[PDB]
Amino acid sequence: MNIFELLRIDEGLRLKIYKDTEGYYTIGIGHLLTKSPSLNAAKSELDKAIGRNTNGVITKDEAEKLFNQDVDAAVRGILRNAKLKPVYDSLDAVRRAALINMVFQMGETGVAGFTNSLRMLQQKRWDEAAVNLAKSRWYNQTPNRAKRVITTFRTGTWDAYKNL
Ligand SMILES: [Cl-]
Ligand SMILES: [Cl-]
């Protein structure tokens, strides 16, 4: 499996503007448009992002393109973050995907705030990291997803996604 498949599973795919778990305007594969309560503002960011007058609807190819870009930015954020990079570099391939997932979901700044967990992941103390990671608003808000990510870090396999 790969990050693309993982996120596609975690985020779904919607071709019309929708509200995410937090009530923010989104489209595609978890492509956040705006934190603003205005559908108009969201439609405007949509058009700006696609380069066309979309009227809140996109095609599958446009969704995929935003997706690729978003994955790429996530990786890039990691590599550019002082707290994140050394962790990511220390992990194996499977676990790196888990880190990407969280950055895509919450942003580089948000993830870089899991200091304790990060340190544990760096030390390769899987069980401890998993417990520390579960003590978070993230886990309490999006438990099913968080559990999949956490299991991934714990086991170093894609098993949590293999039945999905
Ligand atoms: Cl964009
Ligand atoms: Cl969830």
From Swiss-Prot:
GO CC terms of this entry: host cell cytoplasm
Protein known as: Endolysin
E.C. no: 3.2.1.17
Keyword Hydrolase listed: yes
Keywords, sorted A to Z: Antimicrobial, Bacteriolytic enzyme, Cytolysis, Glycosidase, Host cell lysis by virus, Host cytoplasm, Hydrolase, Viral release from host cell
Gene3D superfamilies: 1.10.530.40
InterPro entries: Endolysin_T4_type (IPR034690), Glyco_hydro_24 (IPR002196), Lysozyme-like_dom_sf (IPR023346), Lysozyme_dom_sf (IPR023347), Phage_lysozyme-like (IPR052619), T4-type_lysozyme (IPR001165)
List of catalytic residues: 11 (proton donor/acceptor), 20 (proton donor/acceptor)
pH effect on activity, per entry: Optimum pH is 7.3.
Known outcome of mutating residue 11 to N: Loss of 84% of enzymatic activity
Effect of residue 20 to C: Nearly no effet on specific enzymatic activity
Protein's cellular compartments: Host cytoplasm
Binding site for substrate: 32, 104, 117, 132
Taxonomic superkingdom: Viruses
HAMAP family listed in its UniProt record: ENDOLYSIN_T4
Function: Endolysin with lysozyme activity that degrades host peptidoglycans and participates with the holin and spanin proteins in the sequential events which lead to the programmed host cell lysis releasing the mature viral particles. Once the holin has permeabilized the host cell membrane, the endolysin can reach the periplasm and break down the peptidoglycan layer.
Record note on what altering residue 11 to Q does: Complete loss of activity
Factors inducing expression: Expressed late in the viral replication.
Protein encoded by which gene: E
Effect of residue 117 to I: 500-fold decrease in enzymatic activity
